[PDB]
Amino acid sequence: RTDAPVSKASTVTGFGRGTNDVHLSGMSRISQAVLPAGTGTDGYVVVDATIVPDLLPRLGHAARIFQRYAVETLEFEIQPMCPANTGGGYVAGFLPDPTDNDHTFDALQATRGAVVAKWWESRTVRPQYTRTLLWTSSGKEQRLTSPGRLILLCVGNNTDVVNVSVLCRWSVRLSVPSLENPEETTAPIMTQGSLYNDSLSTNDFKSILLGSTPLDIAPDGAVFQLDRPLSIDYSLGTGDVDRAVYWHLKKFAGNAGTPAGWFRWGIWDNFNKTFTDGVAYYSDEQPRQILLPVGTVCTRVDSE
Amino acid sequence: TNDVHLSGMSRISQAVLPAGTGTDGYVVVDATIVPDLLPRLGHAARIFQRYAVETLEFEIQPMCPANTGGGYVAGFLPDPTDNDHTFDALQATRGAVVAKWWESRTVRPQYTRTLLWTSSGKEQRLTSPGRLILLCVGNNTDVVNVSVLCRWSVRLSVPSLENPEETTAPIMTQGSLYNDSLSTNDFKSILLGSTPLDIAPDGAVFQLDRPLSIDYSLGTGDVDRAVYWHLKKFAGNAGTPAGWFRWGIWDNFNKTFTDGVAYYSDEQPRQILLPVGTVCTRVDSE
Amino acid sequence: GTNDVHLSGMSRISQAVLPAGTGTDGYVVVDATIVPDLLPRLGHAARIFQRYAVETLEFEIQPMCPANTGGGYVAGFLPDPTDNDHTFDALQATRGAVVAKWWESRTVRPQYTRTLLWTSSGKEQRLTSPGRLILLCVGNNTDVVNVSVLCRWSVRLSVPSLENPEETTAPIMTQGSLYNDSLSTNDFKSILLGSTPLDIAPDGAVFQLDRPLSIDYSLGTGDVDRAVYWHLKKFAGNAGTPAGWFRWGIWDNFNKTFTDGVAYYSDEQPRQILLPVGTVCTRVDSE
Amino acid sequence: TNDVHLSGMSRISQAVLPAGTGTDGYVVVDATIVPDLLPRLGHAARIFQRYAVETLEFEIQPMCPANTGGGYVAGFLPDPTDNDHTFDALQATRGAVVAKWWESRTVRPQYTRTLLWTSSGKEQRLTSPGRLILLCVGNNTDVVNVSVLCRWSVRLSVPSLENPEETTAPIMTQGSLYNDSLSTNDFKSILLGSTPLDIAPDGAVFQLDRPLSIDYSLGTGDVDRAVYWHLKKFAGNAGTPAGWFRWGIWDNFNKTFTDGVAYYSDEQPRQILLPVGTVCTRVDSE
Amino acid sequence: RTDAPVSKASTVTGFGRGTNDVHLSGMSRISQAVLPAGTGTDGYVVVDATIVPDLLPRLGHAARIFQRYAVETLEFEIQPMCPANTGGGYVAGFLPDPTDNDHTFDALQATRGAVVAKWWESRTVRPQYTRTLLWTSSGKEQRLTSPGRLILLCVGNNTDVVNVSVLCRWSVRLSVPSLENPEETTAPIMTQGSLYNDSLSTNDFKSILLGSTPLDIAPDGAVFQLDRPLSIDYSLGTGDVDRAVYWHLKKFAGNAGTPAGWFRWGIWDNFNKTFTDGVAYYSDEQPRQILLPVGTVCTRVDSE
Ligand SMILES: [Ca+2]
Ligand SMILES: [Ca+2]
Ligand SMILES: [Ca+2]
Ligand SMILES: [Ca+2]
Ligand SMILES: [Ca+2]
Secondary structure (H helix, E strand, O other), rough: OOOOOOOOOOOOOOOOOOOOEEEEEEEEEEEEEEEEEOOOOOOOOOEEEOOOHHHHHHHHHHHEEEEEEEEEEEEEEEOOOOOOOOOOOOEEEEEEEEEEHHHHHHHHHHOOEEEEEEEOOEEEEEEOOOEEEEEEEOOHHHOOOOOOOEEEEEEOOOOOOOOEEEEEEEEEEOOOOOOOOOOOOOOOOOOOOOOOOOOOOOOOOOOHHOOOOHHOOOOOOOEEEEEEEEEEEEEEOOOEEEEEEEEEEEEEOOOOOOOEEOOEEEEOOOOOOOEEEOOOOOOOOOOEEEOOOOOOOOOOOOOO | OOOOOEEEEEEEOOOOOOOOOOOOOEEEEEOOOHHHOOOHHHHHHHHHHEEEEEEEEEEEOOOOOOOOOOOOEEEEEEEOOOOOOOOOHHHHOOOEEEEOOOOOOEEEEHHHHHEEOOOOOOOOOOOOOOOOOOOOOOOOOEEEEEEEEEEOOOOOOOOOOOOOHOOOOOOOOOEEHHHOOOOOEEEEEEOOOOOOHHHOOOOOOOEEEEEEEEEOOOOOOOOOEEEEEEEEOOOOOOOOOOOOEEEEEEEEOEEEEEEEEOOOOOOOOOOOOEOOOEEEEEOOOO | OOOEEEEEEEEEEEEEEOOOOOOOOOOOEEEEEEOOOOOHHHHHHHHHEEEEEEEEEEEEEEEEEEOOOOOOOEEEEEEEOOOOOOHHHHHHOOOOEEEOOOOOEEOOOOOOOOOEEEEEOOHHHHHHOEEEEEEEEEEOOOOOOOEEEEEEEEEEEEEOOOOOOOOOOOEEEEOEEEEEEOOOOOOOOOOOOOHHHHHHHOOOOOOEOOOOOOOOOOOOOOEEEEEEEEEEEOOOOOOOEEEEEEEEEEEEOOOOOEEEOOOOOOOOOOOEEEEEOOHHHHHHHHO | OOEEEEEEEEEEEEEEOOOOOOOOOOOEEEOOOHHHHHHHHHHHHHOEEEEEEEEEEEOOOOOOOOOOOOOOEEEEEOOOOOOOHHHHHHHOOOOEEEEEEOOOOOEOOOOOOOOOOOOOOOOOOOOOOOOOEEEEEEOOOOEEEEEEEEEEEEOOEEEEEOOOOHHHOEEOOOOOOOOHHHOOEEEEEEEOOOHHHHHOOOOEEEEEEEEEEEEEEEOOEEEEEEEEEEEEEEOOOOOOOOOOEEEEEOOOOOOEEEOOOOOOOOEEEEEEEEEOOOEEEOOOOO | OOOOOEEEOOOOOOOOOOOEEEEEEEEEEEEEEEEEOOOOOOOOOOOOEEEOOHHHHHHHHHHOHHHHHEEEEEEEEEOOEOOOOOEEEEEEEEEOOOOOOOHHHHHHHHOOOEEEEOOOOOEEOOOOOOEEEEEEEOOOHHOOOOOOOEEEEEEEOOOOOEEEEEEEEEEEEOOOOOOOOOOOOOEEOOOOOOOOOOOOOOOOOEEOOOOHHHHOOOOOOEEEEEEEEEEEOOOOOOOEEEEEEEEEEEEEOOOOOOOOEOOOOOOEEOOEEEEOOOOOOOOOOOOOOOEEEEEEEEEEEOOO
């Protein structure tokens, strides 16, 4: 027998008490190449993979529930498929800085774990990694969301086709409970090639021009966004030179003739999840202009 | 007891992937596990309605020269409903293996181990414990003639006589058929995105669970609409390895196909005819 | 007695009358798909709980006819409710299956797998039904046979619920291909589909389809349009055609009434199949 | 054993007593306990002939604002025969409760606990363990929407199939119908003094166990006498909340009502037509 | 220190917890007769008393507070007062069915306890009774409110006046708490005589005609009610034969010439507790009619 109050009190009891930790692990292919005979000249950077939960598929999804993760174990296996008579060599190693962009044989052998071997032999690379707790959501500084990157370079010239596959065996512990939308969980990518407005087409441009191993082997229909604005020279149609400013790209698949592919600029309407295309570039007697400089960061924005 | 245990080893399937064909990802066997597919069990199942799986292993068995230098990944996906052939999907399963094309390997899956039906039905999680997919991981140098073997033991439960056209696994489309992809009388099998359909022999007949609408004309500038529920596979060759499908009428009594009406395209609006996830049972006897 | 009850009863499944000389080897006299509703005392309990599991099944044939009739039958319980093969051999394969003269009652005592089932029907039917009893002829019946089939059952009901009287009746798979050659402008024959549940369904009945019924039509002007209907309604057969006939149209659902909405055009078209083997016809009408 | 135990919780009934209506004594639910009234048990009873009560509790459940300041008394009277709705009668029973309209309470009655029939019969002490009455104790300030719940467990004994029109509780009149209270074609339900009749929906049909005599005329100054056994409820509204009854003919096969002859009053002596204690079963399907 | 609510709660504590059982007993006269010499022919049913709390006066009142009662002990004493030289015989016995209406010596001696004796001897009848729980409120079935009835029949012809008195010694237990109005606690009575509309008067009729031992020795001014309607043939006054329907009677006391008495029909207005009288019966050339058949149940409705 209790009295009738003005207002009863809340009885929302089990709230804010969600599962906290998860150890989780597996083995994931982290890339695959095929090199035809001539290709594979000394030093050709066959692979360059920045490690982030997203790259390890199974992990990537669990990471969308917690805010931190910390690496408990990593190794990579190399496992090219090729017969004994192939006389080319590779060198792999895990770079513990995710920002480091200089890929030389000399800079790998320097890394702990690094391996060197003819194409017909498998190898295991038992690397050195942070074992501290990084973040699952991408951020401004990369040093905080990734423990480093795994690169593999040719060492001689392959006599024949090389079918390399590079597997990462991981185990990791996810630390903090939270809900992170799949847009922010993507890894940022730095270009290593200048984009000139002399090297253009009316509505697209080459992906090899940017000189980035990820953007080269990036998938179709894939909408990106940039930190730096893109300057498109358009016209009213009186011989008039006007200026347009777009922030977003769109990947189109490549060819056997054009290894890397295209990139159509435009507008990524996020409120409605769609992608408009960018205005006709005006070819003109306009001074040479770098529209996007070396080091432009491109972060994937569409639904994954 | 009334229950019957049975065990054996049997070839689940055999593909030949010829020289140079095939590239990382290329699905070289996609087999939905049901007793019909397992030869000796095939006949035992025609007798009862219900089976339950006691043991399952697949032994991969590829045949090529030692210098072949391609590669494959194999594995067993427990969801006969899950339709995702990517390597990443495979590498996520238990049992999964990877090797060079000259190496046999044994995939040791985990599976339902529960009581399932022999004849197909709407929900195919009660007809099958899962499906095995084997993919390419590189480009194969040589002809490889892979023969995947399955060692199996099962428990068969209630006696029955089973219609053999019913025992077969339903195949699902992976790609949409658009109206603008039809030729006058046929279309390319590859459009449907399904390896089991692509490799179904010449003259296989399939019923669809969704209507195939064919716009036609009398030849007066007048567009009319027809409906069809059956397809006939016309075998693929070197020029068109997926082969072709003709729509038409399957007569279930006489067991005969009659080709349907010609497609007439006349300034029609964009249309989806057979959306992805269209189900295609084998109705013709084997 | 909060959640589980055992119920036992026996109950008529179905009655059939064979006119004299009707029926022949393999004539399907009764195809009854089992569901709690079809068995009368049980159907009331299955409305109370939403899960049930079968513990004993037994059917008694009891055909009534003169001692001289001299045709025959064969009956059995076929545990897959999905199984549409109604051949003699396939029936005789069923455990407990019996074959006898039209003037001999028999009892079929089968085995069933005794799974937990649902009371309210859903998409997969092997979760709502333990199977279907079939009875078919094995010679020509000389006399009229008025066959009643009984079912003795004991069952375990499990999860307390209260179901609505509309969802409980199990849908029907069509057995035969409906060609457009067979159409008449107002209606079509029931025997063409070949489903004995359809062939027997009482008139004023309404059945929704899972596949679209594509009706050709024209207001006039020598002009062929194309129309769509999801429903069917049963119009009773007469001694000349016992099958009955089906008339398409519109089943207004708020209405609680049928509207024929049937227009057809008979013309030189290429032969088509409108409703193929396997079409699922759910009973939607008022109850 | 052949006996079946069954237990549940179910709403016995739900009244809305609107703002200001209702005064100390006003009967707001009067429900004779039989399995039909208890929803889930309703169906179980249609199967057997006999039930016996194992447990019974009512939980009262009134819904209004906290400031409602009326009141009610509830209880369970063990005599389905006893026809006395007074507070004093209620306060005499075991279980009886009193509260403000915003307070739920639980009445814990004492009941027969013996073996009873499912279908109605002459002596209704064998069809029911009693009846629950809930009354007003003050004037209610606000609209209250009271929903009285019953938690019950029972034992059902012999299997049977039961006619659902037979399962229903007979209603007894509380007030006499006098001849001088008839209108030309109808009379006011309130005259009969029965809450269950007063709240029976529009179009309910009732059979009487006593004849309703209607004096009529041909229009010649000649008085004649007719007899009727059926009433039809015509729904009550704000102006006449009890509604009205028309006498007539119920056709039991076609399940249709035909209104009877007009009443003609012509210097007739005072008469009792339907004495108090006239029994009125629901014959129309529900 | 408690806060002020919107509404305090009910404090109606001791409710619904009334006294439950009562054993209670006594000895009550259940009837009395006086038989003048000639009367008392073999088999004359001198007494016929249906046992119900009401008949036992003290008990009758307690019974209005509980719903059930169950009999714990019964005996009857017979105790005629008469001198040794009276040469007649009686036979008593308790019929355990309250509905049984055939009173023969042969049907008593059959009953357990039954006694037979010359008028000048007392007797005790130790009967057989239900000992189950009946109901205090009358109902449709009598088998449920009464354990049976005590009848006493003459056995020879009394030479002299016979003053018999028949006492019932009882003990009973009252089971269920409730409040039962004195109108429903009365016992129903079945007639054993047809009422013809040829055997009538303008406003009343004989009580012996009904042929019921209770209704015969029923008291004055005593308003009854029937299950079956009564058909009174009245007139508008043009020689017109109209039809009237009354449900209620009224007892008027009897005579030395008319042992049983009268019964005036009418209207028992219960809302106001009064009794109107019924219309002038129209004597007419009307076909012979049974107005109330054998077995009509008459239940007392006025205040007791
Ligand atoms: Ca985060
Ligand atoms: Ca089967
Ligand atoms: Ca359900
Ligand atoms: Ca009954
Ligand atoms: Ca009582």
